Amino acid sequence: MLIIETLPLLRQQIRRLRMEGKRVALVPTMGNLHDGHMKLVDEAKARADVVAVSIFVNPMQFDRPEDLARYPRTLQEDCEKLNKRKVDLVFAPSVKEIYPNGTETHTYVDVPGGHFRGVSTIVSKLFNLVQPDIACFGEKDFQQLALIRKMVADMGFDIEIVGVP
Amino acid sequence: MLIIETLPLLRQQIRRLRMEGKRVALVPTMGNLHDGHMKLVDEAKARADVVAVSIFVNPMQFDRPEDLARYPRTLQEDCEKLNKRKVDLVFAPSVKEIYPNGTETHTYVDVPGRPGHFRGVSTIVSKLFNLVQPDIACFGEKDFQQLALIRKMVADMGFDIEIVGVP
Ligand SMILES: CC(C)(CO)[C@@H](O)C(=O)[O-]
Numbered sequence: 375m376l377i378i379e380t381l382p383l384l385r386q387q388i389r390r391l392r393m394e395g396k397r398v399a400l401v402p403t404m405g406n407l408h409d410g411h412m413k414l415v416d417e418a419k420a421r422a423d424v425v426a427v428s429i430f431v432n433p434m435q436f437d438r439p440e441d442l443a444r445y446p447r448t449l450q451e452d453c454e455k456l457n458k459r460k461v462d463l464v465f466a467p468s469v470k471e472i473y474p475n476g477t478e479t480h481t482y483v484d485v486p487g488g489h490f491r492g493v494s495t496i497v498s499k500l501f502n503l504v505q506p507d508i509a510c511f512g513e514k515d516f517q518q519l520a521l522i523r524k525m526v527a528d529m530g531f532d533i534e535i536v537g538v539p
Numbered sequence: 540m541l542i543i544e545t546l547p548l549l550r551q552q553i554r555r556l557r558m559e560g561k562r563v564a565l566v567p568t569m570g571n572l573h574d575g576h577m578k579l580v581d582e583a584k585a586r587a588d589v590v591a592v593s594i595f596v597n598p599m600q601f602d603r604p605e606d607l608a609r610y611p612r613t614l615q616e617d618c619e620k621l622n623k624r625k626v627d628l629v630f631a632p633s634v635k636e637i638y639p640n641g642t643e644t645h646t647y648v649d650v651p652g653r654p655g656h657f658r659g660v661s662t663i664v665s666k667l668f669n670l671v672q673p674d675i676a677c678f679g680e681k682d683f684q685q686l687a688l689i690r691k692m693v694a695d696m697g698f699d700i701e702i703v704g705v706p
């Protein structure tokens with residue numbers, strides 16, 4: 375398994391996978407992975423040659439800084455679990471790599487029809503960075519899954535959005 | 540030169556270009572092309588294997604229906620100029636095709652750091668960038684606020700697209 379923390383190195387591998395003809399699935403996560411997140415990984419492995427999992431606790435989608443600060447961070451353990459599940463690549467960026475000037479002045483994506491603006495923004499950016507053929511999301515957060523399906527339909531992303539029960 | 544009017548046929552074209560691994564340049568336009576747009580096309584041709592030009596009068600970036608309705612439409616003459624320049628693809632969608640559920644509740648992109656005009660720009664250019672997935676995209680320097688907007692949008696949103704400003 376490859377663990378990538380920077381944009382240039384991620385871009386290099388995305389390009390390599392593209393030149394190798396790999397079908398790529400992305401599983402976005404905020405880390406603190408449990409057996410339940412493996413449903414996403416297992417669906418992704420069946421549906422692609424290569425599985426990339428992002429781990430990024432996204433400040434733009436937390437209403438309270440207290441909650442962002444207390445969100446569990448267990449990177450070594452997440453990566454252990456992913457490596458055992460045969461994941462190919464983990465993308466684990468820093469906050470500043472994602473939001474160089476902070477979130478308040480960052481370009482955002484809003485899906486009509488703070489929390490959800492944070493979700494469409496980071497998921498669009500992960501789609502632009504990883505350029506996956508397929509991306510897997512839980513059905514449990516049904517508002518989030520609805521928001522991403524609409525975002526994709528509206529914004530022209532060529533990505534199959536897979537809801538996992 | 541091929542004229543592509545629908546998303547699924549554009550999808551077909553872009554998927555094919557991707558698996559062929561060609562380097563692709565996109566020139567976004569609203570048609571009514573003249574010398575300045577030809578400079579954009581020339582640059583795109585010099586910088587990529589394949590050049591796509593979009594022609595789409597984007598309602599989201601016009602505040603007044605009167606201004607949208609007055610915008611000149613010269614598709615035949617636009618295609619004549621692009622064909623002469625050996626453009627590979629011209630993407631010329633209808634409004635219903637880009638906005639099948641209307642602009643009002645369409646996803647939008649807004650870049651901080653007429654009310655509505657720039658939001659309409661960032662939104663359509665993001666969508667064009669997702670649809671076409673170009674390696675490079677050319678814009679004029681004269682609309683300097685637009686060029687700055689797109690420059691920031693690309694840097695912020697993580698698009699792997701080289702932005703080229705042309706006089
Ligand atoms: C989709 C996601 C990883 C985006 O930050 C997050 O909202 C989540 O944990 O569902």
Ligand SMILES: CC(C)(CO)[C@@H](O)C(=O)[O-]
Nearest residue numbers: 410411512513514515539
């Ligand atoms: C898979 C999951 C943990 C992702 O948030 C959630 O959808 C769930 O519990 O099914």
Ligand SMILES: CC(C)(CO)[C@@H](O)C(=O)[O-]
Nearest residue numbers: 567568569597660663664
């Ligand atoms: C960039 C653009 C094609 C977006 O509709 C338009 O604003 C233009 O022609 O400058």
